[PDB]
A paper describes a structure:
Interestingly, in contrast to the other nat_mutants, NMR-derived CSD plots for both mutants revealed more significant changes in comparison to the WT, suggesting a more far-reaching modulation of their fold or plasticity toward complex formation with RNA. We were able to solve the 1.7 Å and 1.9 Å crystal structures for D63G and P80R, respectively. Surprisingly, both mutant structures superimposed with WT similarly well as the other nat_mutants, with RMSD values of 0.668 Å (D63G) and 0.898 Å (P80R), respectively. In line with the retained backbone at this position in the crystal structures, {1H}15N heteronuclear steady-state NOE (hetNOE) values of backbone amides in the D63G mutant do not differ significantly from WT around the site of mutation. On the protein level, mutations D63G and P80R also impact the gene product of the overlapping shifted open reading frame ORF9b47,48, where they result in T60A and Q77E, respectively.
N plays a major role in RNA genome replication, translation, and packaging and has further been found to interfere with host-integrated stress responses and stress granule formation.
Numbering used by the authors: 50 to 171
Write the structure that this text describes.
């Protein structure tokens, strides 16, 4: 499980951030730790007609070296994965932060610093 709540893509543009932006605020992490990826999670449902459809994609953040793409190095090219890093982060895996157990931690509400650029529809 991600440490954070998702970003929902209500529009047609997939997620991306300008370099330096996009890492969720987490006061239980340090400057070196501010680096990772969002991963798209799509869900299907039965619509009100007889028919399966996609819900709006969700994008969940994971620290570098953790989560479903724990094996990927920063910048690796993969569909549904985008990368973010705050100025000064170390490009090292964040096993010390890891992923969340919902049994014993709520998700942290995803917040970005004042004035982050967001694609249309986030």
């Amino acid at each position: 499980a991600s440490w954070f709540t998702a970003l929902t893509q209500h529009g047609k543009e997939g997620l991306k951030f300008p370099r330096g932006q996009g890492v969720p605020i987490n006061t239980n992490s340090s400057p070196d730790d501010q680096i990772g990826y969002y991963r798209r999670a799509t869900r299907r449902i039965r619509g009100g007609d007889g028919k399966m459809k996609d819900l709006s994609p969700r994008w969940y953040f994971y620290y570098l070296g953790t989560g479903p793409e724990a094996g990927l190095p920063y910048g690796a090219n993969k569909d549904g994965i985008i990368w973010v890093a705050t100025e000064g982060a170390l490009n090292t895996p964040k096993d010390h932060i890891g992923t969340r157990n919902p049994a014993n931690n709520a998700a942290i509400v995803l917040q970005l610093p004042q004035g982050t650029t967001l694609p249309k529809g986030f």
